[PDB]
Amino acid sequence: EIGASSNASDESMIETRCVLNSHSTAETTLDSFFSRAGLVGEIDLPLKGTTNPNGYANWDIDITGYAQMRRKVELFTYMRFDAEFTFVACTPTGEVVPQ
Amino acid sequence: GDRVADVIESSIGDSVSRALTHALPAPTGQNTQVSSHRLDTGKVPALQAAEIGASSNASDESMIETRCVLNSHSTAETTLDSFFSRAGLVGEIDLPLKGTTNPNGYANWDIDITGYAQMRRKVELFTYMRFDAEFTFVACTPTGEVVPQLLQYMFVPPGAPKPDSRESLAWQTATNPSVFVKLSDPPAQVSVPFMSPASAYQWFYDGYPTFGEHKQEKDLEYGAMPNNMMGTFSVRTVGTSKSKYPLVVRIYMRMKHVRAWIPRPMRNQNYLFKANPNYAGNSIKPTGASRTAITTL
Amino acid sequence: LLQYMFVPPGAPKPDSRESLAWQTATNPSVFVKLSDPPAQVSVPFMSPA
Amino acid sequence: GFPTELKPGTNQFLTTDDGVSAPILPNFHPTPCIHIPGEVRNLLELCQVETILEVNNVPTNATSLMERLRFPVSAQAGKGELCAVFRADPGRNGPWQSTLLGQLCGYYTQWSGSLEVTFMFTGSFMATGKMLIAYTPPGGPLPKDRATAMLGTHVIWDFGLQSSVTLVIPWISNTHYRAHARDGVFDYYTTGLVSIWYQTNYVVPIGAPNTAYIIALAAAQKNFTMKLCKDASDILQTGTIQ
Amino acid sequence: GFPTELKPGTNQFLTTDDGVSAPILPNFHPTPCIHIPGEVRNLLELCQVETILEVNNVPTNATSLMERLRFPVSAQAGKGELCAVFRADPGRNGPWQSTLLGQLCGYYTQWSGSLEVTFMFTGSFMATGKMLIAYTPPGGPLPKDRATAMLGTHVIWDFGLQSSVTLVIPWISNTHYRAHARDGVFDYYTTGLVSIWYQTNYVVPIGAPNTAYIIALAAAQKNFTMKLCKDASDILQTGTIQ
Amino acid sequence: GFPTELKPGTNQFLTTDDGVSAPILPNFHPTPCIHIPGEVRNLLELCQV
Amino acid sequence: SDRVAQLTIGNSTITTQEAANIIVGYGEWPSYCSDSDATAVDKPTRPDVSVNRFYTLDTKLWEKSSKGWYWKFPDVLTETGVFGQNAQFHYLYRSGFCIHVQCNASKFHQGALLVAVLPEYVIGTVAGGTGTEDTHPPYKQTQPGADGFELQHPYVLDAGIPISQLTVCPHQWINLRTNNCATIIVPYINALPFDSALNHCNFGLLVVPISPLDYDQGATPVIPITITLAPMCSEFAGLRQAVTQ
Amino acid sequence: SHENSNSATEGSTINYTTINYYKDSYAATAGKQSLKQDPDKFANPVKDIFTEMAAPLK
Amino acid sequence: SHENSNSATEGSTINYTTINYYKDSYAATAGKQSLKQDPDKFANPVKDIFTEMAAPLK
C-alpha cells in the first residue's frame, strides 16, 4: 500500500551460494539504447502525380510518423539530445541515377 | 560448527583443477643434439608399451648417431589464427526477377556456416570454439556484371519479427542494425562479437533440447542446441516496385580471436545434410587410396 | 567482377567456372573489378631451398 | 599527397557506427539545463519497479478488460486444490506482457538474474486463510496435486496485517544467459512454472463477503541484466500515421 | 582537407588481409569463459599423437575395411623373406591418409623434421619371433632381399613383454623443407621406403594359433614443422548440402 | 571521418614507385640462408673485370 | 609397481594384477565448480559416498565375428542407485568419471581392443543408403541404456569419422598377451558448468576389436567383457518432482 | 582539444571520452557513459525508510 | 587505448598486440599469438610418468 517495491532477496528467503557476477550493465544505458538509426521521414519527388510534381517538396520536421522510434522515445517525457541525420536517395526501383 | 573429523579432512569444496602438465614455449623446432654409440643393458628406449595409450618418447639421439643441428624453423604458421583467419564461403542468397525461390525482391537466410565443406571440415576438427568474426558481402548478377542498384541488409536476432515482404515495417531498423550499400561500391564488411549465451560454439551436441516422450515424429530435433542459432540475415532491393536486374549475394566469414578445445577425428565421407552427421551407407569409400599387394608398391 | 586464386603445389586445380575449388577457405584470393584500379599484392620467398 | 589505399567496408552506412559527422550551425551554444526531477541514467532503474501482472488473462471483450488485473479466491472444502498457474518467462507471450519488464525484454534478446513476484490481498479484515505458492523449475511437468508442487521452491503466507508476500524466482540455469523462449527447440530456455494452492481454506464470518480478490506485482531483483539489443515484434502501426 | 593520393591495391578484397572492420553491436560484452578441459593452442600438439596406419590397404569392399588396420605374420621356412613395404611420404596418397598427421599436411605444403612409426604385436604370449625393420633412403631401389635393406637404417625387435618397437625416420634431405611428392618431377622430394623382413622365424607351440597380427602407429617427433597453408584436395561435397 | 582531399596522381600505377603493398601469406617465415660463394652487391664489381 | 593396481573409492574396491598405468583424460583431474564460473545461486548437495562409487553395468560377449559397441554416459546410471534417484529429482548435474574395463584370457588367446572416450559423439544414420532419404536415429540408439548398443559400420564409427584417428582421444588397448584391463579417468567436459543428466549425454565410451579374437578348440570360447565405472565429484541442483525422461 | 562546450551534456556530473575533428562538440561521438544507478528514486522513495527484516507497519 | 574489453580472448594467459580505431575490441586485428605448446596433454597424460631409457612395465 505504501507504493514502494519489495526488498526481499535470494539470501533471505532460501539457501544460496557465493556467485561472483561479472555481467555488465553497459548495454542498457541510453546511448547504447537510442544511438541506433531509424526511419523518421520520407519525401517524394515524382515526375507526374499529385503530391509534389513540380520538383520540390517541403517536409515538416517531426519524428512522430513511424512507431518503432516513436515508442522508444514515448517511454520518456522530456529529452535533451543531439542528433545525426542521414539521407538515402533512390528511384522506386532502387536504381541509382546521375542527378 | 565443524567438530567432526571426516568434515575437516574432507576433499569437498575444491575449485582447483589439478593439472599434471604445464605449457612451455616453442618458437622454433627442437635442436638436435649430438650422440654417440652405447652398448649398455637396462637402458632401452626402443621398447615401448602402447597399451597404456601414450605416445612414444624415443628420439633420433637415442636410436642412432646424430650431429648437432641448430633448428630455426618457426612454429608460427600452425597456430589457430594463422590457420583459421582465412576467409571462405558460408552462404548464398539469390534475388532473381522471376523464379520460385525468392521472386518478390526479398530473402531470409538462416545463419549457419555448415553448408560448404572446405570450412566445415576445418572447424569439425574441434568441438567447442570461441571466436569473433568478420563477414564480407559480394553482390553481382549471374554474369558477374556490376549494376547501379541499392541494397539493404538487416541482422534479425532471435525473437524479432522476420519480414514477410519488401514493403514491410520491419525494415525501419530502429533497434536492429542494418547496412545500406550499392553494387558500384566495394564489398560491404563488418565485425561480429561472440554472441552466444554459452561459453563456446559447439559444433556437436549429443542430446535433445527439450523434455518429453521422444516419439519418431520429433526426432528431427536431435543435435539441436539453440545456443548456436544466432538468428537471421535479411536482404532486399530498396524501393516500392520490382527491380530491373537479377542479383546474387555471397557471404564470406573470417574468424579471429580464436580459442578451441577438444580435438577429434576428421570427416572422410561426403556431407549430405546440415546439423546432421549422416553418411551414405551403400557408398562407403575408404579413408584413402588402395593398391594390390602389401609386399609391393 | 573477377576472382583470382593462388593455387599452391599439391592443391586441387579448378577444372571449371562453377567448381568447388573456388570457395578459397585456405588458399588466398583477390576479388576485384575492372572499374577499380589495378590489383596489387606482396609475395614472400616461397622456396624450400 | 600522402598515399592511401581504400579497404573494403567503404561507402557504407552502418546504422550503429559511432563516428563523427559534420555540423551545420557553428558557434551554436544551446540553452542551459535546469534541474528536472526524475533523471534516469539506465533502464535497470525501471526493471526494478513493480507493475501489475495479468494472471487472469481469459477475457477479451472491451468491458471486462479490467478483470485481467486480479484473480479471486473463494471458500472451498479443504482438500488442497488448485487456483492458478503461470510461467516464469517474461519475454514470452503471456501475463508478463503487461509489465514494464516484459516490454523492455522485447528490446533485448538475452536475460539473466533473479526475478520476484509480489501478491496482495484485497479482501476483508475479518477474513483468514493460508496459501502455498510454489516454483517448479524446468523439466518437470505441471503438478497435478498440492503434494507434488511442494517438492520445489515454495512459500507459505498467512493473511493478516501485512497484506502481501514476496515469492522469489532464483536463477537456476545451465547457461549464464537466456534468450527468449517459445514453442519449438527454444524451450531449452524455459524458466519454469508458478502454481498456487490452498493450504487450509478461506475462512470468513457472518456478514462479510464470501469471495475476495488477489492482485499480483511482477518485477526483478538487483542481479538482472539484458544484452544484444534488437527491435520488438509489436509494431504499433497499420498504414501511415497521418 | 588533408591531401591524399590513392595508390593501387585499392577497392580490393584480399581474404588474408589482417585489417580492421566496423562493428554492429556497441558496448556488447560477451559471456565469460569457464575452464573447459582440452585447450589446444597449436596443431603440433596433435601431429605428435599416434594414429593407426593402414599398411594393409588392399581391400575395398565395405565389409572388409577393418582389415586395413592390421597386417599378419605367420610361420615360414626361415630364409629371410619379405612381409610388407610402404613409403615414408605422409602428404602422398597411401597408408598415411588414415592419420591425423597426413590430413594436417594437406592444409600445409612444405614439411620438415623427423618422423616415427611404432608397431605393436597382437599375438599370443607363448609366441616368439624377431623382425628386421629398415628404412631405405631416397635414390635406392626397392630391396630385393634382406641382405640389401640391411645396409640402411634398421631396427631389430624381439617379441616379448614390451609388445612394441619404435622405428625412427630421421631427416635426411638436401633441402631444409619438402613440398609434397607425386609421380613426375616432384619425386625430387620423396622420403624413402620402409621394408619389413624376417630375421629368424615365427615360432609357436602346440595349442596356440599359427597366425598373428601386427598393428602400426604413425606419428611425428618434436622437430616437425609445416608452412605455406593451402586448401586440400579432398573436398567432401558433391552438390548442395541441404 | 577525418577530412581528406584526393590530389592528382591518383589511381595510377607507376612501375618505379617504391611503396607498400598488401601480403597474402601471414606469419610466413621463409627458409634461412646458408653461405653461398659469390655474393655481388653492386654491378661495378663486374665492370672492373 | 606399474602392473599391480588398486582403486578404492566409496564402500567399494577393485584389484588387478596384469594391468597398465592409469590415464587422466585431457590431462587434468575432476573438480567441483568455482564460485566465479558458476551462475546458479541455489546451494547444491554433495553426498560424496552414496554416488561416488563403482557401479557395474552389464557383461557382453566377444566372439570372433564381433564388431564393436558403445555406451553413452551418464545415461548408463539414470536408473541405478542414489545417483539415479537424485538425477531424476534435480535438473542440473555435474560429475566426473573413472572407467574400468575387464576382459581376461589365458596365454594361448590373442586379440586387441580399443577403449576410447569421445565427447559429443553424435550418431548418424545411413540416409537410406542412396544418400537422398533424410532419416534420424531413434531414441533407443541415442540413449540406449545400460545394456549398450552394437555398431553396424565401425570403420566410420557410424558418424562419418574414421576409427584410425580415435587415439587422439583418451584411449587404451587390451592386448591379451600383455594386459587384461583399462582404467580411464575423465573430468567434466562441457561448455556449461551445469547441465542436465537426462537430455544431454556428454560423451560415449567405445570398445572396438581391431585384431580379432582367436584360439584353438579345447579352449574356453566364452570371453566376456565387463564394464565398471564410478562417478566422482558429483553435484546436483534444482530440486523438484522426479522425471523419468 | 581547443573546441567549444556546445554539447548537450555540458553540465552533467559524468565523464566521457570522445573523438572529434570539428570545433563544435555536438559533432563528437557518443562515447562511453559513466555506469551508475539510483533505483531508490523509483522503488523506495519513502520518507521514513524501513528495515528488510523488521516488518514495515508497526 | 581507452577501449572496452569486449574481445573473446579477454581472460586468456597470453599477450597480443593489435591495431584498432573503434571503441569495441572485437573489431581489432587478429595479431600475433604467444607461441606455446603442451603435447603431454595428448601424448603422455599418464598419472605415473616413466623414463625414456628404463622400460615402462616393471
Ligand SMILES: Cc1nc(-c2ccc(OCCCCCN3CCN(c4ccnc(N)c4)C3=O)cc2)no1
Ligand atoms: C543541411 C541540412 N540540415 C539538416 C537538418 C534538418 C533538421 C534538423 O532538425 C532535427 C531536429 C529533430 C527534432 C526532433 N523532435 C523533438 C520534438 N519533436 C516532436 C515532434 C512532433 N511532436 C512532438 N510532440 C514532438 C521532434 O520531432 C537539423 C538539421 N538537414 O539538412
Ligand SMILES: Cc1nc(-c2ccc(OCCCCCN3CCN(c4ccnc(N)c4)C3=O)cc2)no1
Ligand atoms: C548489418 C549486418 N550484420 C551482419 C551479421 C550477420 C550474422 C552474424 O552472425 C554471425 C555468427 C556466426 C555463427 C557461426 N556459428 C556458430 C555455430 N554454428 C552452427 C551452425 C549450425 N550447426 C551447428 N552445429 C553450429 C554457426 O554457424 C553477425 C552479423 N551482417 O549484416
